[PDB]
Scaffold this motif. Structure first.
Motif, PDB file in Angstrom:
ATOM      1  N   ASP A  96       0.808  -1.498   0.110  1.00 47.34           N
ATOM      2  CA  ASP A  96      -0.092   0.046   0.137  1.00 47.34           C
ATOM      3  C   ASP A  96       0.773   1.261  -0.037  1.00 47.34           C
ATOM      4  OD1 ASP A  96       1.139  -0.344   2.406  1.00 47.34           O
ATOM      5  OD2 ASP A  96      -1.030   0.184   3.664  1.00 47.34           O
ATOM      6  N   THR A  97       2.204   1.318  -0.046  1.00 45.82           N
ATOM      7  CA  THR A  97       2.979   2.233  -0.495  1.00 45.82           C
ATOM      8  C   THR A  97       3.446   2.838   1.044  1.00 45.82           C
ATOM      9  OG1 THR A  97       1.591   4.178  -0.619  1.00 45.82           O
ATOM     10  CG2 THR A  97       2.290   2.830  -2.564  1.00 45.82           C
ATOM     11  N   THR A  98       2.971   2.281   2.229  1.00 51.87           N
ATOM     12  CA  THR A  98       3.491   2.837   3.517  1.00 51.87           C
ATOM     13  C   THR A  98       4.955   2.056   3.629  1.00 51.87           C
ATOM     14  OG1 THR A  98       2.168   0.887   4.497  1.00 51.87           O
ATOM     15  CG2 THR A  98       1.051   3.100   4.313  1.00 51.87           C
ATOM     16  N   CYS A  99       5.396   2.365   5.026  1.00 51.61           N
ATOM     17  CA  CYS A  99       6.733   1.826   5.326  1.00 51.61           C
ATOM     18  C   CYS A  99       6.568   0.803   6.499  1.00 51.61           C
ATOM     19  CB  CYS A  99       7.694   2.650   5.878  1.00 51.61           C
ATOM     20  SG  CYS A  99       8.060   3.861   4.390  1.00 51.61           S
ATOM     21  N   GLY A 100       7.640  -0.226   6.460  1.00 49.33           N
ATOM     22  CA  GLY A 100       7.438  -1.364   7.675  1.00 49.33           C
ATOM     23  C   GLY A 100       8.651  -0.786   8.641  1.00 49.33           C
ATOM     24  N   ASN A 101       8.939  -1.860   9.346  1.00 48.60           N
ATOM     25  CA  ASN A 101       9.856  -1.790  10.424  1.00 48.60           C
ATOM     26  C   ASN A 101      10.096  -0.452  11.499  1.00 48.60           C
ATOM     27  OD1 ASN A 101      11.370  -4.146  10.065  1.00 48.60           O
ATOM     28  ND2 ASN A 101      12.676  -3.280   8.427  1.00 48.60           N
ATOM     29  N   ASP A 102       8.694  -0.114  11.798  1.00 46.49           N
ATOM     30  CA  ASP A 102       8.505   1.012  12.282  1.00 46.49           C
ATOM     31  C   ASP A 102       8.948   2.367  11.922  1.00 46.49           C
ATOM     32  OD1 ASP A 102       6.884  -0.091  14.203  1.00 46.49           O
ATOM     33  OD2 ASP A 102       8.075  -0.367  15.864  1.00 46.49           O
ATOM     34  N   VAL A 147       7.799   5.854  10.402  1.00 46.93           N
ATOM     35  CA  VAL A 147       6.359   6.302  10.093  1.00 46.93           C
ATOM     36  C   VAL A 147       6.031   6.499   8.632  1.00 46.93           C
ATOM     37  CG1 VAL A 147       4.767   7.890  10.861  1.00 46.93           C
ATOM     38  CG2 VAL A 147       6.429   6.874  12.125  1.00 46.93           C
ATOM     39  N   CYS A 148       7.066   7.209   7.859  1.00 50.56           N
ATOM     40  CA  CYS A 148       6.916   7.712   6.529  1.00 50.56           C
ATOM     41  C   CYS A 148       5.771   8.567   6.041  1.00 50.56           C
ATOM     42  CB  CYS A 148       7.041   6.334   5.607  1.00 50.56           C
ATOM     43  SG  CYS A 148       8.604   5.585   5.465  1.00 50.56           S
ATOM     44  N   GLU A 149       5.815   9.908   6.901  1.00 54.61           N
ATOM     45  CA  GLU A 149       4.626  10.605   6.684  1.00 54.61           C
ATOM     46  C   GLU A 149       4.670  11.043   5.374  1.00 54.61           C
ATOM     47  OE1 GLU A 149       6.779  10.327   9.285  1.00 54.61           O
ATOM     48  OE2 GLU A 149       6.248  11.962  10.752  1.00 54.61           O
ATOM     49  N   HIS A 150       5.841  11.296   4.665  1.00 57.75           N
ATOM     50  CA  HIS A 150       6.009  11.821   3.412  1.00 57.75           C
ATOM     51  C   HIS A 150       5.302  10.745   2.267  1.00 57.75           C
ATOM     52  CE1 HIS A 150       9.209   8.878   3.722  1.00 57.75           C
ATOM     53  NE2 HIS A 150       9.455   9.090   2.271  1.00 57.75           N
ATOM     54  N   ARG A 151       4.927   9.566   2.891  1.00 57.63           N
ATOM     55  CA  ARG A 151       4.522   8.510   1.993  1.00 57.63           C
ATOM     56  C   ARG A 151       2.845   8.567   2.113  1.00 57.63           C
ATOM     57  NH1 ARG A 151       6.273   4.419  -0.900  1.00 57.63           N
ATOM     58  NH2 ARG A 151       8.434   4.520  -1.281  1.00 57.63           N
ATOM     59  N   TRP A 152       2.307   9.149   3.224  1.00 59.35           N
ATOM     60  CA  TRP A 152       0.659   9.089   3.248  1.00 59.35           C
ATOM     61  C   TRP A 152       0.388   9.828   2.230  1.00 59.35           C
ATOM     62  CZ3 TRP A 152       0.097  11.180   9.205  1.00 59.35           C
ATOM     63  CH2 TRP A 152       0.713  10.330   9.948  1.00 59.35           C
ATOM     64  N   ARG A 153      -0.756   9.433   1.680  1.00 61.31           N
ATOM     65  CA  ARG A 153      -1.278  10.195   0.468  1.00 61.31           C
ATOM     66  C   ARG A 153      -1.742  11.545   0.545  1.00 61.31           C
ATOM     67  NH1 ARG A 153      -6.364   9.056   0.991  1.00 61.31           N
ATOM     68  NH2 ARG A 153      -6.563   7.002   0.350  1.00 61.31           N
ATOM     69  N   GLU A 154      -2.293  12.180   1.941  1.00 58.74           N
ATOM     70  CA  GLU A 154      -2.779  13.360   2.150  1.00 58.74           C
ATOM     71  C   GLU A 154      -1.546  14.301   2.081  1.00 58.74           C
ATOM     72  OE1 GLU A 154      -3.079  10.458   4.001  1.00 58.74           O
ATOM     73  OE2 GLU A 154      -5.461  10.273   4.507  1.00 58.74           O
ATOM     74  N   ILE A 155      -0.350  13.957   2.364  1.00 57.65           N
ATOM     75  CA  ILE A 155       0.768  14.767   2.595  1.00 57.65           C
ATOM     76  C   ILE A 155       1.378  14.606   0.999  1.00 57.65           C
ATOM     77  CG2 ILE A 155       3.112  15.054   3.562  1.00 57.65           C
ATOM     78  CD1 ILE A 155       1.751  13.938   6.315  1.00 57.65           C
ATOM     79  N   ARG A 156       1.772  13.611   0.558  1.00 57.18           N
ATOM     80  CA  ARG A 156       2.357  13.557  -0.791  1.00 57.18           C
ATOM     81  C   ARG A 156       1.532  14.257  -2.033  1.00 57.18           C
ATOM     82  NH1 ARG A 156      -0.531  10.212  -4.150  1.00 57.18           N
ATOM     83  NH2 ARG A 156      -1.127   8.101  -3.316  1.00 57.18           N
ATOM     84  N   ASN A 157       0.143  14.100  -1.821  1.00 54.13           N
ATOM     85  CA  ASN A 157      -0.390  14.829  -2.751  1.00 54.13           C
ATOM     86  C   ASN A 157      -0.788  16.417  -2.469  1.00 54.13           C
ATOM     87  OD1 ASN A 157      -1.146  12.648  -4.202  1.00 54.13           O
ATOM     88  ND2 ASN A 157      -3.270  12.409  -3.618  1.00 54.13           N
ATOM     89  N   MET A 158      -0.451  16.903  -1.375  1.00 55.93           N
ATOM     90  CA  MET A 158      -0.357  18.342  -0.953  1.00 55.93           C
ATOM     91  C   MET A 158       1.082  18.948  -1.384  1.00 55.93           C
ATOM     92  SD  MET A 158      -2.987  19.653  -0.339  1.00 55.93           S
ATOM     93  CE  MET A 158      -2.325  21.242   0.031  1.00 55.93           C
TER      94      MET A 158
END
Ligand SMILES: CO[C@H]1O[C@H](CO)[C@@H](S[C@H]2O[C@H](CO)[C@@H](SC)[C@H](O)[C@H]2O)[C@H](O)[C@H]1O
Ligand SMILES: OC[C@H]1O[C@H](S[C@H]2[C@H](O)[C@@H](O)[C@@H](S)O[C@@H]2CO)[C@H](O)[C@@H](O)[C@@H]1O
Ligand SMILES: OC[C@H]1O[C@H](S[C@H]2[C@H](O)[C@@H](O)[C@@H](S)O[C@@H]2CO)[C@H](O)[C@@H](O)[C@@H]1O
Ligand SMILES: [Ca+2]
Ligand SMILES: [Cl-]
Ligand SMILES: [Hg+2]
Length: 496
Positions: free
Chosen positions: A375-381, A383-394
């Motif tokens: 789903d394009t999110t990150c693992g291993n704890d 957070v990868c906020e830069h990959r959250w749709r809401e943030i990347r699209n903004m």
């Protein structure tokens, strides 16, 4: 020093906190480049002391022992490869330059360092640089403790030991040149600029002397005569002797008032309302737009360090965090920095996290790789906020509306607001405890647009909410207060 030097059309940088060089190189190619990110702020690449008690905290990287590119993030080889690979896909690299001090004065002597270099804090000996006893401010500080006892006296703030860290004598050419040579090595590798750590604890004139020694950027990726981007970390919330304006001559400055006040407004504390953000920016007492580097949270205050602050929004408060980040990315004020962090186990005693020392995900000291899920999110704890749709699209939204004027503001006198950027973008927020239903003038051409917060434009359709803008520019918006993301954003490139 004020120009970010990003590839044209790119307007944000992301702090990939504690990420390894190999992971950042991959991220640039598979994500940051294609998704329009302007650059990456990396953790300090120079050798630091190894702290075993507590076990490898994030802050050990702010205790330099030498200028060798050898850390838990990687070696010189991997660092060069990362810079090259990122530059080749249009993503710049910005280095966190820790130049105010070395390691802790009360640290043990030995080779307990990330690269095996020797150091002796007690005798002020750093053979790998080399630095000696007279390269420090010991005799310059006038406090009884030797540390910073009061922030109302500019002398001790800059000449004394910051939390017991050996303070470098930046007035000396020996020290100035040693630092400049380290920074120049980075510039020659391909780095675009620097975050000057603890700038508040150094004299504006000393920093300027170091900056005057820096080379132009690498001609393989940058135009001739390009100067490195400079952003100084100066914590100034007012009420102290030192002000952010004292550093305007060296380059940009971190505007810490931005996140502190935005957080208070979004949390709806102290009588603040979102409708008050109409004059957001210099109208709120912030430094000039062309001198500021803005952000919601940073690596320090997201965990109570630095100036801290209870109002600071982080990934822990996801729903509100996305609203604040969304507002920042949509608003024309300053140059924007997005945070990307890792999760740690918090333990609050007396309203404070005592686990704020916890370092990045690791396997017995070795930083874990950043794994990417389906789903394009990150693992291993991570957070990868830069990959959250809401943030990347903004982040994309900001690129699309770059240079467009603040326009068509609307508010309900409480916590529902909306505004556009020229005729290329529009955003609506509902931070009230009730529904939003209005027909607002967007300033956009007529047609059907895909809301980039709830979804994406895929081919000739939208995966989320569709907004219809009539021929005159008006559009009906309906946002429930219980909605997952209580805000909608549409732009010229999300139009069907
Ligand atoms: C610059 O602040 C951040 O890093 C520092 C240094 O790592 C820590 S303080 C840390 O190290 C000092 C010096 O050895 C000792 S003694 C005052 C302290 O107990 C440690 O926490 C700071 O916390 C970070 O914010
Ligand atoms: O503890 C490490 C940090 O120490 C101070 S943060 C400091 C702030 O500058 C002051 O304005 C008030 S809020 O006290 C704060 C806590 O001592 C340095 O400025 C940071 O750079 C450093 O990282
Ligand atoms: O683009 C990847 C995903 O991004 C977020 S999931 C995100 C969520 O918005 C936050 O509130 C907290 S729960 O972190 C989440 C990531 O772990 C979108 O909502 C997803 O639809 C999307 O798949
Ligand atoms: Ca100093
Ligand atoms: Cl910062
Ligand atoms: Hg040391």
């Amino acid at each position: 020093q004020y120009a970010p030097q990003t590839q044209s059309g790119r307007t944000s940088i992301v702090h990939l906190f504690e990420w390894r060089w190999v992971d950042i190189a991959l991220e640039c190619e598979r994500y940051l480049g294609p998704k329009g990110f302007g650059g990456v702020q990396v953790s300090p690449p120079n050798e630091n002391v190894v702290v075993t008690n507590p076990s490898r905290p994030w802050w050990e990287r702010y205790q330099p022992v030498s200028y060798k590119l050898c850390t838990r993030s990687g070696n010189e080889n991997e660092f060069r490869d990362m810079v090259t690979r990122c530059n080749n896909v249009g993503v710049r690299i910005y280095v966190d330059a820790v130049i105010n001090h070395m390691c802790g004065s009360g640290a043990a002597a030995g080779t307990g360092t990330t690269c095996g270099s020797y150091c002796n804090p007690g005798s002020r000996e750093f053979p790998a640089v080399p630095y000696s006893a007279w390269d420090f401010n010991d005799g310059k500080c006038k406090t009884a403790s030797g540390g910073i006892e009061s922030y109302n006296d500019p002398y001790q703030v800059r000449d004394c030991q910051l939390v017991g860290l050996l303070d470098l004598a930046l007035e000396k050419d020996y020290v100035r040149s040693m630092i400049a040579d380290y920074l120049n090595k980075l510039i020659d590798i391909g780095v675009a600029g620097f975050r000057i750590d603890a700038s508040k604890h150094m004299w504006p004139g000393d920093i300027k002397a170091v900056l005057d020694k820096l080379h132009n950027l690498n001609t393989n990726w940058f135009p001739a005569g390009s100067r490195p981007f400079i952003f100084q970390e100066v914590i100034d919330l007012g009420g102290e002797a030192i002000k952010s304006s004292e550093y305007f001559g060296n380059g940009r400055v971190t505007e810490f008032k931005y996140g502190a006040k935005l957080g208070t407004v979004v949390r709806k504390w102290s009588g603040e309302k979102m409708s008050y953000l109409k004059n957001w920016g210099e109208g709120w007492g912030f430094m000039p737009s062309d001198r500021a580097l803005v952000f919601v949270d940073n690596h320090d205050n997201q965990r109570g360090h630095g100036a801290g602050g209870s109002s600071i929004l982080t990934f822990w408060d996801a729903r509100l965090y996305k609203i604040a980040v969304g507002f920042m990315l949509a608003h024309p004020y300053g140059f924007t920095r997005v945070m990307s962090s890792y999760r740690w186990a918090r333990n609050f005693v007396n309203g404070e996290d005592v686990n704020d020392w916890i370092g990045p995900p690791n396997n017995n000291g070795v930083i874990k790789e950043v794994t990417i899920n389906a789903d394009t999110t990150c693992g291993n704890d991570w957070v990868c906020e830069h990959r959250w749709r809401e943030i990347r699209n903004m982040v994309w939204f900001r690129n699309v509306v770059d240079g467009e004027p603040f326009a068509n503001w609307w508010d309900n006198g409480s916590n529902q607001v909306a505004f556009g950027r020229g005729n290329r973008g529009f955003i609506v927020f509902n931070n009230d405890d009730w529904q939003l239903s209005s027909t607002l003038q967007t300033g956009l051409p007529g047609g059907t647009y895909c809301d980039v917060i709830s979804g994406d434009k895929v081919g000739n359709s939208c995966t989320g909410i569709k907004v219809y803008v009539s021929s005159d520019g008006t559009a009906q918006f309906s946002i429930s207060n219980s909605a997952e993301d209580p805000f909608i954003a549409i732009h010229a490139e999300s139009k069907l």
